[PDB]
Amino acid sequence: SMADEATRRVVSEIPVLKTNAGPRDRELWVQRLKEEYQSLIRYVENNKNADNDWFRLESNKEGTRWFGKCWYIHDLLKYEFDIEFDIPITYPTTAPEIAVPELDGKTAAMYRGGKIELTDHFKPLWARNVPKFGLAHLMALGLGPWLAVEIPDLIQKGVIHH
């Protein structure tokens, strides 16, 4: 399957996650957060080695709210956007909704509050992999390809400026 190979190419060097736990699941949630941080930090270190260090994320104390920044390079100019999301109670079965608040309402591929709209193919891909995919995979398979379409479009349309 061409979709299966495309998924493995993009995510193969990201540690897989294991624990089916969300924010209310106590010691299993603490364990899931260790998996999330181990997977994110390996992804960031691979990104640095590939000259594609394109985001930073931190969480609140309980790991229920995430925020930081992404960078997108277009014609050698670097654009920064603040990003944030809440962990759904039903995570990791349900994918979190990444918001880019400063782009709220500026593209059709987005809901109110700047919640990005991923393709229909992302949700079944996530679903079929639960609970192996985590926040690293959401960035690599979700926000990453969203920026590569939407940011060039918004620059060419003059809606965002460096």
From Swiss-Prot:
UniProt key word Flavoprotein: no
Cross-link (Glycyl lysine isopeptide (Lys-Gly) (interchain with G-Cter in UFM1)): 123
Effect of residue 33 to R: Abolished interaction with UFL1
SUBUNIT field: Interacts with UBA5 (via C-terminus). Interacts with UFL1. Interacts with UFM1. Interacts with KIRREL3.
A single BP term in Gene Ontology: response to endoplasmic reticulum stress
One Pfam family recorded for the sequence: UFC1
Protein name, entry field: Ubiquitin-fold modifier-conjugating enzyme 1
Family: Belongs to the ubiquitin-conjugating enzyme family. UFC1 subfamily.
Any coiled-coil regions, as ranges: none
Taxonomic lineage: Eukaryota, Metazoa, Chordata, Craniata, Vertebrata
Active site as annotated: 117 (glycyl thioester intermediate)
Free-text domain note: In absence of UBA5, the active site is solvated by water molecules thereby reducing its nucleophilic activity. A linker region of UBA5 is required to reduce the amount of water molecules in the vicinity of the active site and elevate its nucleophilic activity.
Keywords in alphabetical order: Disease variant, Isopeptide bond, Ubl conjugation, Ubl conjugation pathway
Modified how: Ufmylated at Lys-123. Deufmylated by UFSP1.
GO cellular component, one term: extracellular exosome
An MF annotation (GO) of this entry: UFM1 conjugating enzyme activity
Source organism per UniProt: Homo sapiens
Domain of life, source organism: Eukaryota
Gene giving rise to this polypeptide: UFC1
Transmembrane parts of this sequence: none
